[PDB]
Design a binder for this molecule. Structure first.
Ligand SMILES: *[C@@H]1CC(=O)N(CC)C1=O
Ligand SMILES: *[C@@H]1CC(=O)N(CC)C1=O
Lengths: 306, 306
């Protein structure tokens, strides 16, 4: 028993981080097979970032202007190309530590682990969710750009995020591994608006099921509700609307606990209108929305990986 | 910016987990050099655990009764011995992946990362603190015994915890790597009392400094206090008393932020007496006590590891 915000084991990703330098800018790259992936703003100076013309900046760079370092191992760049907002550096050495892997573009509300790196070296690992406004609430200092987010499926690493930017509000934005930003953001140092950060309802419900499984039952009430009535209350509290797909994904948790999804929704509704009244749930005094239904099942069943 | 409950990267430990079987009991072992470490209750059946006589049970075991598996790699046991509550199995193969390492016995309030494993395979990693009553609030299912807790110092892994038991209250107990339990607990399935779980005050203060560094300043008040006056209030709320050693360890955070430790103590005192009033700090509605002062510095400065 017990319930923790658990990250994936990071060993398979640790072996893929390198340091990429171009001019005086140093960040992190991801070395898979014979390609290194990194943010294209490695070719920018601090002044360039206010209004960069990436095509024009990239024209004055040759293969030998990119220094890629894996420990004290020097990789030779034999080709480079820009794909959307990432640079692909072809090197002469395939990474012997290349895990089995796949690039995935995730949806808001999904969760992943971030391996925070500086100078190609791992600093720590934590779990987070892609917010509905396409930001993440990370922990990133200068130099962390190119750190990656990932999930593990048995022996397979799914890379879903590469860190690019901190917004002036203190939240973080980045791309998938094809270089397409999540959200409306661009790799320019300019004021950029994020939208409303709503709460991920299907994740809150999953975490309430985790609570019941672990013995926290006080919030279970006498009421039920309908999906329209719940969604009417949810939207007033800046909660994401629940759909039938969400009800379907929660089915295994409803079966294991004997609590109908709509019954759990009526419990959540009372919590939104009456608050927690100084109570806690799974050691939190706020409703937690960074566990997906699959996260809960994984942690409550003991799934392992390569 | 941003602040996250960050675990250490787990790659160096992943390479040291094996599966240990004896009879019908399977758990995890830690393979370092040519020794495997595991909980001695691997030699117990489920009935033995009610009242085990370990010396007597161990007499009916020979080297070949212990099966140790690292992937599909079979290790040969050439010697075994009991040291306190851990078994030391000497195998014929040194682990080629042995990191540089050291066994440490930690103090309550210190933090470490746990690599939760099942059948010798990593499941996830999370950060936690040794509670003042010598339990940890972990996430562990059956089969997780022998999972280890650790810290990293550059290239050096410090192993500090091995999981042994879940108490009937749902909290977790274990040993250092010399087999000595943390706390008054024994490896017997019997009702065992844990004492009061107090809040780790010096960690709460460190996290308040992290908040100020990251822009959460609302709780900073007009008052100051003394260490005796604060400790008088702290003890009423089941907070650990603060000592001068604690003030000393917080010195670098006081210097960076310009806020005297005793001033921060008076802010904490008002929070204890008046509550948060629906406010949050670093996204939490409770005072968080699982960051040490060193954790805060590490995360706010970007320390990295091998
Ligand atoms: C992991 C290895 C890989 O490429 N795949 C393809 C679908 C995986 O699931
Ligand atoms: C890491 C490697 C090791 O054995 N030590 C000794 C003090 C470390 O700090």
């Amino acid at each position: 028993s017990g319930f923790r915000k658990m990250a994936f084991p990071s060993g398979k990703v640790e072996g893929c981080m390198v340091q990429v330098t171009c001019g005086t800018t140093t960040l992190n790259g991801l070395w898979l097979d014979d390609v290194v992936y990194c943010p294209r703003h490695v070719i920018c100076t601090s002044e360039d970032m206010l209004n960069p013309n990436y095509e024009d900046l990239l024209i004055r760079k040759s293969n030998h202007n990119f220094l890629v370092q894996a420990g004290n191992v020097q990789l030779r760049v034999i080709g480079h190309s820009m794909q959307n907002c990432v640079l692909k550096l072809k090197v002469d050495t395939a990474n012997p530590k290349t895990p089995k892997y796949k690039f995935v573009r995730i949806q808001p509300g999904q969760t992943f682990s971030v391996l925070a790196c500086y100078n190609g070296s791992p600093s720590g690992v934590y779990q987070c969710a892609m917010r509905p406004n396409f930001t993440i609430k990370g922990s990133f200092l200068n130099g962390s750009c190119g750190s990656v987010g990932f999930n593990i499926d048995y022996d397979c690493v799914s890379f879903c995020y590469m860190h690019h930017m901190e917004l002036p509000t203190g939240v973080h934005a980045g791309t998938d591994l094809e270089g397409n930003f999540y959200g409306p953001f661009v790799d320019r140092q300019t004021a950029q608006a994020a939208g409303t950060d709503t709460t991920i309802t299907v994740n809150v419900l999953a975490w309430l099921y985790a609570a019941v499984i672990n013995g926290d039952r006080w919030f279970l009430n006498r009421f039920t509700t309908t999906l329209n009535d719940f969604n009417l209350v949810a939207m007033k509290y800046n909660y994401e609307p629940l759909t039938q797909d969400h009800v379907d994904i929660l089915g295994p948790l409803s079966a294991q606990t004997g609590i109908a999804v709509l019954d759990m929704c009526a419990s959540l509704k009372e919590l939104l209108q009456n608050g927690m009244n100084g109570r806690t749930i799974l050691g939190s005094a706020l409703l937690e929305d960074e566990f997906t239904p699959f996260d809960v099942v994984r942690q409550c069943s003991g799934v392992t990986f390569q």
